[PDB]
Amino acid sequence: IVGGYTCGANTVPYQVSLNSGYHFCGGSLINSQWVVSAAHCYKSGIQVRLGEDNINVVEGNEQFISASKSIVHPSYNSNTLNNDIMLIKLKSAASLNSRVASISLPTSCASAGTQCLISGWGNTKSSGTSYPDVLKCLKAPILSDSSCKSAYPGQITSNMFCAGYLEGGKDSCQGDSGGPVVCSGKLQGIVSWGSGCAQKNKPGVYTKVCNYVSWIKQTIASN
Numbered sequence: 001i002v003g004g005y006t007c008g009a010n011t012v013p014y015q016v017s018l019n020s021g022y023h024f025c026g027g028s029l030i031n032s033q034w035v036v037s038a039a040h041c042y043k044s045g046i047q048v049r050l051g052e053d054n055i056n057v058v059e060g061n062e063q064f065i066s067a068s069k070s071i072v073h074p075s076y077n078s079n080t081l082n083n084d085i086m087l088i089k090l091k092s093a094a095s096l097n098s099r100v101a102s103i104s105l106p107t108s109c110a111s112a113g114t115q116c117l118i119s120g121w122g123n124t125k126s127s128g129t130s131y132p133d134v135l136k137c138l139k140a141p142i143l144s145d146s147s148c149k150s151a152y153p154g155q156i157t158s159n160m161f162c163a164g165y166l167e168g169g170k171d172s173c174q175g176d177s178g179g180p181v182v183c184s185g186k187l188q189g190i191v192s193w194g195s196g197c198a199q200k201n202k203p204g205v206y207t208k209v210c211n212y213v214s215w216i217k218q219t220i221a222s223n
C-alpha cells in the first residue's frame with residue numbers, strides 16, 4: 001500500500017497473509033474454513049496466516065493453517081487477468097474471535113463514489129521497494145467505469161473496477177494482491193493489478209466480487 005496508514009494490530013480481522021515460506025499475497029476470510037484471494041496468487045504449498053499484524057513476529061493472536069485445496073475460477077485468464085479470483089480451503093476451521101473474523105460477501109455491487117478500505121503488506125513505495133511488515137490501510141473511493149476504462153483503454157472488463165485517486169500518490173501495490181477491498185462492511189473487491197503503483201491516471205484495478213457470489217457460494221457448498 002502506497003500512501004496509506006498503519007491500520008493497527010488486528011483491526012482488519014478478515015485480512016489474511018498467504019505464506020509459502022514467505023508472505024506472497026493477501027486474502028480475505030469469508031467463513032471459518034474458506035479464504036478469497038486473487039487467481040494470480042495461485043501456487044502450491046499455501047499456508048494461510050490469520051490474526052497477523054507484524055508478519056515477521058509471532059505476537060500472540062495468529063493462527064497458521066495449511067490449505068487443503070485451492071480453486072481458481074474456471075474462466076480466469078492470466079494474460080488479461082479477467083476473473084482474477086480463487087478460493088482457498090483451510091485444512092481445519094479457524095477459531096473465530098474479535099481478531100480473526102470473516103467478512104460478509106456483498107448483497108449488491110457497490111457504486112462509484114463509495115468509500116472502501118484496502119489493506120495489505122505490500123510495497124509502500126511508488127519508486128523502489130520497501131515492505132512494511134505491519135498491515136497498511138488505505139481509504140479510497142470506487143471510480144466510475146468510464147474513468148476506469150479511460151485510464152486503461154482496452155483492459156477493463158465487466159469483472160473489474162478501479163478504486164483510488166487519478167492524481168496518484170495513494171494505491172495498492174506489489175504484495176497486496178489478493179487482499180480485500182471492503183465497502184460498507186462487505187467484500188467488494190480483490191486487489192488485482194495496476195500499471196506501477198500510485199502513478200497519475202493509473203489507479204488500482206480490483207476484481208468485482210459481486211459478480212462471483214453465486215460461484216463462491218456454490219463452490220463452498222460442494223467442496
Ligand SMILES: NC1=NCc2ccccc21
Pocket residue numbers: 171172173174175176177191192193194195196197198203204205
Ligand atoms: N494497484 C496496483 N498497482 C500495481 C499492483 C500490483 C499488484 C497488485 C495491485 C497493484
Ligand SMILES: [Ca+2]
Pocket residue numbers: 052053054055056057058059062
Ligand atoms: Ca505475526
